[PDB]
């Protein structure tokens, strides 16, 4: 059972819920973690969607090796795990596991491309990734090893480059918001937040209310030409003349499992959004075994899963029925069927939905489309009730005065703001000096969707014209 | 274009074979290889095959961490990679990558399995293995770092254990046989090469004719008890009592990729089966309007078309191209052909050309392309079973590993021979060492007065050896 209230005592009741649904199991090295089927079936569902729709962009698959030479990764940091030797023989040098695959892939890039006719060149990994993050690991958000795809791209021109971060961006929107129903912010990054190899990063961004942070959800870089200026990644154009190639990269991780968890829970414990729950519909059989009722079970399963409704019957004999509720309950399966001997006498069953315990007495021929209807409801309105506490998270303010206050309130704030480099260093300072005394805040993005902007209005911090609307907050 | 020729020096036409179809990028840390799209996507039609099959036997997916403590895996290895610092900061205790998982994923089963309420546990995982190998590293066969998939159960009862141990080999056996066409020899690894871990160890063997070497395609263990008494998986029966479980473990690699080549491949390189080929039909322009419409047509008919339309490349270099890479058909279509109302044809393993009438296309390329299929495999077959001898003595051994062959031969199972049999070999090929590939599971019939190859005393089983990978 799950006990630690959310909204009260969020830290333990997240802990709970994983382990408690069989998501996670601990593990002796420090930010790693098992994961279990419950939780890696619904990263198998996101890597097949995004992986089906990056197929048909024209991206192709390849596998690059998790080693890279000192030598090649520090050509141009504390997190890189290095290998230095095997059994009892030292390396040569040592050896670093892959952090991210730039040092690995770019060298190739610069090789394989030599002419426009081998442009563009579009890849993608699925790949583990090793870093030794300093901050406190958290399940899913922030481990030393984590899964991720990471997609690498080279274009004759900006246009098709930027064509392609956008095309990645909504895809990641997508996953998020289409998969696993939460909703996302598309902005770009600040200067001080960007990726600093690259010229321009977009991001999805997401809000946690429970303790009022924000959370970078996947990112998409136009790189510019600088990686190619660096590696020496070449054309020659249709003119014969030597031209740098431009550059995308994008990557989203297990991190959005997580972010899922916390977005849809309650407090009995996980709720699963449908299109990614390894089961749907749980058949319950109301039993404390003539063969009747399991027999029945059978037949409705056989019949749904026509449908392509994923069903488990939980036919455990030593367990009572409001035991295996509340176990399925704590698990986030969307469904739940009950089928006693009251049922079996009618010809109905009983559906109980876990987003709000709305029951259904439901016939069974109208079993299949029914339950069709009611995960699209499902699905939806999870959906629709995080959207709507993302919108009441994010308070729109004109002054710096109005930032604290809103911050105590596990607030994200909105703010005009000059953009100047500076002021976003002076604004982490003094909002981790104010917080202290009674924390830093930062950018998390500038949305591409803006509120208006009345023609006099200035910067909240430095009282300069403010160039657009950013969204700030507390954030992992 | 490959120069080099398959029975002539065969490492030269492999490497040739995998750089210029563009299946493998070289690298600078010894032993790993980039794998291109053009590799990985037929990684991917496998694991896709064999995820789906083991799915339907309720097996699941998870991911256990790609580290182990130093404790925990030294508990009872020079291939072990040792991982010691974080920048330059040094690490409490030095942690090693994974080069299998039983140490990792074994003691949450001791803690997730109380009861037969628990059975069966069914898991795998897809991740890298990473092993500082000492043999001769050769890409797909042989690497440091490989891809692979590892499952892992726990019954009730060793019969349950031993089903599952042979559903999953005839799973291996569909993955070489179904999808890559390549024939492969079902056994039982002798005493001497078996997981030392477990009970017994079955295994699909497979043999590279160029070389004479056998090779492991796959394996599944009946690990029996032994490692749910050193990592403590007990549970309560019916009855109430401990008892402890009974376990497989089995596992398939990359390696497949480069057994499917070199079964295949040709002097002009690649030839890609059917059932993995990422593009089956690659059409090619020499009119623009009419390739999208048969493209159209054939994708009806769930066939994998590409039209290679790029302008930057003579349809010349297309055929090359294409050949190199092993797309089993190819289809021509000019202005003569535009009003013939035909296609030209071109089989990649036999070079058969065939004049089909747009109408006739999907049919008939699907008649074909189930003849390539049955095709590489039937000859890949005959190919393999020309490479066994029969024979009796060991005197016969040495002449058949200098043709090149594998030898069938009855033997004692006594394990100090096998060891025996292995420095002899060694020392006549100085003057290369021939072990033990498996005990078929199909045995000849063995006549009551028949002898031990080579130590003389009453022969056991019938037992297939040569050299190896
Ligand atoms: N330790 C981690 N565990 C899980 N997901 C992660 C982790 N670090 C990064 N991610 C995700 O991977 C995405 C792209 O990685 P990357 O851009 O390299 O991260 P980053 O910029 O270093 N984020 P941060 O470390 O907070 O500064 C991020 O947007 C995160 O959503
Ligand atoms: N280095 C490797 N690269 C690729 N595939 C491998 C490698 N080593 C083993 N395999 C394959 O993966 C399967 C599972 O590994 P496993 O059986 O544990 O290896 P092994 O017993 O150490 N083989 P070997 O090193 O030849 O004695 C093996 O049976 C091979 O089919
Ligand atoms: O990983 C990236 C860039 C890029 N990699 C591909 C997809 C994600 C995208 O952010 C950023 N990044 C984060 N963290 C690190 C590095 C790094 O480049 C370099 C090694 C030190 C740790
Ligand atoms: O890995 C196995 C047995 C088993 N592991 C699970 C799936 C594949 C199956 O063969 C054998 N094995 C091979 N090589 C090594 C080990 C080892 O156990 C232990 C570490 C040293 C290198
Ligand atoms: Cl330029
Ligand atoms: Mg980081
Ligand atoms: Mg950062
Ligand atoms: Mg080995
Ligand atoms: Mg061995």
Same mark, same amino acid.
Request: neutral net charge; hydrophobic residues 20%.
């Given at each position: 059972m799950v006990t630690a209230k959310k909204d009260e005592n969020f830290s333990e009741w997240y802990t709970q819920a994983i382990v408690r649904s069989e998501m996670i199991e601990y593990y002796d090295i420090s930010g790693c973690y098992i994961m279990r089927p419950w939780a890696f079936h619904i990263w198998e569902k996101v890597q097949r969607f995004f992986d089906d729709e990056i197929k048909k962009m024209g991206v192709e698959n390849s596998y690059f090796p998790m080693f890279v030479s000192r030598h090649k990764l520090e050509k *141009? #940091?504390? *997190?890189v795990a290095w290998v230095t030797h095997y059994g009892d023989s030292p390396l040569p040098e040592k050896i670093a596991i892959r952090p991210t695959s730039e040092t690995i892939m770019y060298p190739a890039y610069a090789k394989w491309i %030599? #002419?426009? %006719?081998?442009?563009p060149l579009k890849l993608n990994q699925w790949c583990s990734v090793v870093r030794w993050e300093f901050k406190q690991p958290t399940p899913?958000? %922030?481990?030393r090893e984590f899964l991720w795809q990471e997609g690498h791209t080279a274009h004759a021109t900006e246009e098709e480059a930027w064509e392609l971060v956008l095309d990645i961006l909504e895809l990641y929107r997508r996953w998020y918001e289409e998969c696993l129903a939460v909703p996302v912010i598309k902005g770009e990054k600040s200067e001080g937040e960007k990726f600093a190899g690259g010229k321009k990063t977009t991001t999805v961004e997401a809000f946690i209310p429970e303790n009022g942070r924000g959370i970078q959800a996947a990112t998409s870089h136009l790189l510019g030409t600088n990686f190619a200026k660096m590696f020496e990644i070449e054309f020659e154009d249709e003119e014969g003349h030597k031209r740098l190639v431009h550059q995308t990269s994008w990557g989203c991780t297990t991190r959005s499992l997580g972010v899922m968890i916390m977005t849809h829970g309650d407090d009995k414990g996980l709720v699963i959004p449908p299109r990614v729950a390894s089961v749907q519909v749980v058949i319950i059989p109301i039993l404390f075994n003539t063969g009747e009722i399991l027999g029945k079970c059978r037949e409705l399963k056989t019949m749904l899963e026509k449908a392509d409704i994923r069903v488990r019957i939980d036919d455990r004999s030593n367990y009572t029925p409001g035991w295996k509720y509340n176990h399925w309950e704590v698990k986030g399966v969307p469904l739940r069927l009950e089928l006693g001997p009251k049922d079996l006498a009618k010809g109905t069953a009983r559906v109980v939905r876990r987003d709000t315990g709305e029951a259904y007495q439901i016939s069974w021929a109208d079993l299949a489309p029914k339950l069709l209807e009611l995960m699209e409801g499902i699905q939806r309105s999870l959906f629709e009730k995080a959207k709507a506490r993302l919108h009441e998270g994010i308070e729109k303010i004109s002054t710096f005065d109005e930032v604290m206050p809103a911050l105590n309130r596990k607030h994200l704030v909105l703010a005009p703001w000059c953009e100047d480099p500076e002021s976003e260093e002076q604004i982490k300072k003094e909002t981790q000096k104010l917080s202290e005394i009674q924390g830093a805040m930062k950018t998390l993005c500038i949305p591409f969707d803006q509120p208006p902007m009345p023609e006099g209005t200035k910067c909240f911090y430095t009282g300069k014209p403010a160039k657009r609307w950013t969204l700030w907050g507390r954030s992992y």
């Open positions: *141009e #940091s504390p *997190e %030599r #002419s426009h %006719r081998d442009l899913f958000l %922030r481990t």
